[PDB]
Amino acid sequence: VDYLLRLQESISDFYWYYSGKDVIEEQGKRNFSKAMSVAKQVFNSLTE
Amino acid sequence: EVQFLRTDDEVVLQCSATVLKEQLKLCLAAEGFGNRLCFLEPTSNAQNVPPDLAICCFILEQSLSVRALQEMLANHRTLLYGHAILLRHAHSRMYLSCLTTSRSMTDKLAFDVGLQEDATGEACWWTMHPASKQRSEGEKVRVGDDLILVSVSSERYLHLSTASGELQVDASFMQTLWNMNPICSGCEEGFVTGGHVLRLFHGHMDECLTISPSDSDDQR
Amino acid sequence: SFMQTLWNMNPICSGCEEGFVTGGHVLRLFHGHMDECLTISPSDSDDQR
Amino acid sequence: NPCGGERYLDFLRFAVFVNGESVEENANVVVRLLIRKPECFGPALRGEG
Amino acid sequence: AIMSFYAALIDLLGRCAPETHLIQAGKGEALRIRAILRSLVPLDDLVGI
Amino acid sequence: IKYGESLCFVQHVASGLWLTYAAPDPKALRLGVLKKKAMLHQEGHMDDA
């Protein structure tokens, strides 16, 4: 749960970084995708 | 459950100093109109001399994360350590800010702490940080917790300075532990709460308790 | 010896619920969860331990 | 220890400035660390004394 | 040694100072860093040295 | 009371004082000392558990 909280805070920071921008570029999309894959795995672990 | 601080609540910023081998509690205060500079109102002798608490009350107007604040500047939440808060003076409706002036003689790297009319810029934003390892960044700020306040614009701590003869409050690079004691959180509609200004009417007879008019023979 | 004496077998402990502290136990007193324990000074210190 | 302080300040200068321009990413971090440890400024730039 | 330490410190802070193009673009972080450096080092002291 | 989980404040029965840590004396952190003398105080601190 603590790791999930750290990850959520990092993802919120990323969203705030990109909120003003109109389109998220390729590298930002790639980093979002990596973080989301990790978060998916963490959610699956908690569910299990 | 352990009480948490939330935005729109009312708090007093409280510190403690050892004077003549005695712990003395003080609250951050400021008049606002006529004097923007903050000072310290003692509250340890409340049994014998009531403190002037009307001007020590602040409202937690907002609490964002650092990046959210950056975006906002570029363009009832629960407070968390590492967030930046905005504190509005209840009486004057000004905001606690780190001023760009300095009247201190002891510290050459300190700034004055006072009230600012508007909430524009980063001078009025302060970041909360845990005082001990018992709490960490991202944890909820809990009533009665000692926390450290850092200016967003100057990267300076909210500091209690005893270097001179008297106790004063400034923004320096030395840290001080403050308590955000809650005054009020939320009042049921139509009910009286302490610290309120009101009139005391004789029953419903359109007669109020008062003192004599200014320039009277009874000395008011 | 061949003379008799009366003894009492006073119980100290019978059975402890798992994970609970009981008297007469040796333990460490940690400051919250900060990896800091209550202790005395090291052997051969000036404060006489 | 001014002599050692000078060596450490010198390593930091190379990190902060590259090719005649300041590396903002390192410069901001260095400034924040230095202000968080005011003793790094020497006894002269102390606030009180 | 003392003079060299303070010279190195002032050099490091000057090199940490932001660039003019960032200042012209009015970046909040650049302005804040420059304000912090200006607060650390007075102008009269620089002129005196 | 449970091991690890329960957080307990220590109180001197006769006097009612609370087991806490003395205000960290200066120059000791400067040397590098990271041990805090424990004291019995009338109020203590919130992290005394």
Curated annotation (Swiss-Prot), chain A:
Coiled-coil zones: none
Post-translational modification: Channel activity is modulated by phosphorylation. Activated by reversible S-nitrosylation. Repeated very high-level exercise increases S-nitrosylation.
Cell compartments where the protein resides: Sarcoplasmic reticulum membrane
Mutant phenotype after disruption: Perinatal lethality, due to severe defects in skeletal muscle development. Neonates do not breathe and do not move. Mutant mice show defects in muscle fiber development. Their muscles do not show a contractile response to electrical stimulation. In addition, mice display abnormal curvature of the spine, thin limbs, and an abnormal rib cage.
Highest rank taxon of the organism: Eukaryota
Binding locations of Ca(2+): E48
UniProt note on tissues of expression: Detected in muscle and myotubes (at protein level). Ubiquitous. Detected in diaphragm, skeletal muscle, esophagus, spleen, submaxillary gland, adrenal gland, cerebellum, brain and in testis germ cells.
Function field: Cytosolic calcium-activated calcium channel that mediates the release of Ca(2+) from the sarcoplasmic reticulum into the cytosol and thereby plays a key role in triggering muscle contraction following depolarization of T-tubules. Repeated very high-level exercise increases the open probability of the channel and leads to Ca(2+) leaking into the cytoplasm. Can also mediate the release of Ca(2+) from intracellular stores in neurons, and may thereby promote prolonged Ca(2+) signaling in the brain. Required for normal embryonic development of muscle fibers and skeletal muscle.
Family: Belongs to the ryanodine receptor (TC 1.A.3.1) family. RYR1 subfamily.
Protein name stated in the entry: Ryanodine receptor 1
Organism of provenance: Mus musculus
Species lineage: Eukaryota, Metazoa, Chordata, Craniata, Vertebrata
Residues of the full protein shown: 3923 to 3970 of 5035
Swiss-Prot record, chain B:
Expression tissues: Detected in muscle and myotubes (at protein level). Ubiquitous. Detected in diaphragm, skeletal muscle, esophagus, spleen, submaxillary gland, adrenal gland, cerebellum, brain and in testis germ cells.
Domain of life: Eukaryota
Organism: Mus musculus (Mouse)
Coiled-coil annotated residue ranges, if any: none
Consequences of knocking out this gene: Perinatal lethality, due to severe defects in skeletal muscle development. Neonates do not breathe and do not move. Mutant mice show defects in muscle fiber development. Their muscles do not show a contractile response to electrical stimulation. In addition, mice display abnormal curvature of the spine, thin limbs, and an abnormal rib cage.
Stretches assigned to the MIR domain: 76-131, 138-183
Residue range from the parent sequence: 11 to 243 of 5035
Protein name, per record: Ryanodine receptor 1
Mod. after translation: Channel activity is modulated by phosphorylation. Activated by reversible S-nitrosylation. Repeated very high-level exercise increases S-nitrosylation.
UniProt free text on domains: The calcium release channel activity resides in the C-terminal region while the remaining part of the protein constitutes the 'foot' structure spanning the junctional gap between the sarcoplasmic reticulum (SR) and the T-tubule. Pore opening is mediated via the cytoplasmic calcium-binding domains that mediate a small rotation of the channel-forming transmembrane regions that then leads to channel opening.
Compartments in which it is found: Sarcoplasmic reticulum membrane
Family per similarity comment: Belongs to the ryanodine receptor (TC 1.A.3.1) family. RYR1 subfamily.
Disulphide-bonded residues: none
Swiss-Prot record, chain C:
PTM section of the record: Channel activity is modulated by phosphorylation.
Tissue: Detected in muscle and myotubes (at protein level). Ubiquitous. Detected in diaphragm, skeletal muscle, esophagus, spleen, submaxillary gland, adrenal gland, cerebellum, brain and in testis germ cells.
Superkingdom in the source lineage: Eukaryota
UniProt subcellular location: Sarcoplasmic reticulum membrane
Phenotype on disruption: Perinatal lethality, due to severe defects in skeletal muscle development. Neonates do not breathe and do not move. Mutant mice show defects in muscle fiber development. Their muscles do not show a contractile response to electrical stimulation. In addition, mice display abnormal curvature of the spine, thin limbs, and an abnormal rib cage.
Subunit text: Homotetramer. Can also form heterotetramers with RYR2. Identified in a complex composed of RYR1, PDE4D, PKA, FKBP1A and protein phosphatase 1 (PP1). Repeated very high-level exercise decreases interaction with PDE4D and protein phosphatase 1 (PP1). Interacts with CALM; CALM with bound calcium inhibits the RYR1 channel activity. Interacts with S100A1. Interacts with FKBP1A; this stabilizes the closed conformation of the channel. Interacts with CACNA1S; interaction with CACNA1S is important for activation of the RYR1 channel. Interacts with CACNB1.
Domain notes per entry: The calcium release channel activity resides in the C-terminal region while the remaining part of the protein constitutes the 'foot' structure spanning the junctional gap between the sarcoplasmic reticulum (SR) and the T-tubule. Pore opening is mediated via the cytoplasmic calcium-binding domains that mediate a small rotation of the channel-forming transmembrane regions that then leads to channel opening.
Family per record: Belongs to the ryanodine receptor (TC 1.A.3.1) family. RYR1 subfamily.
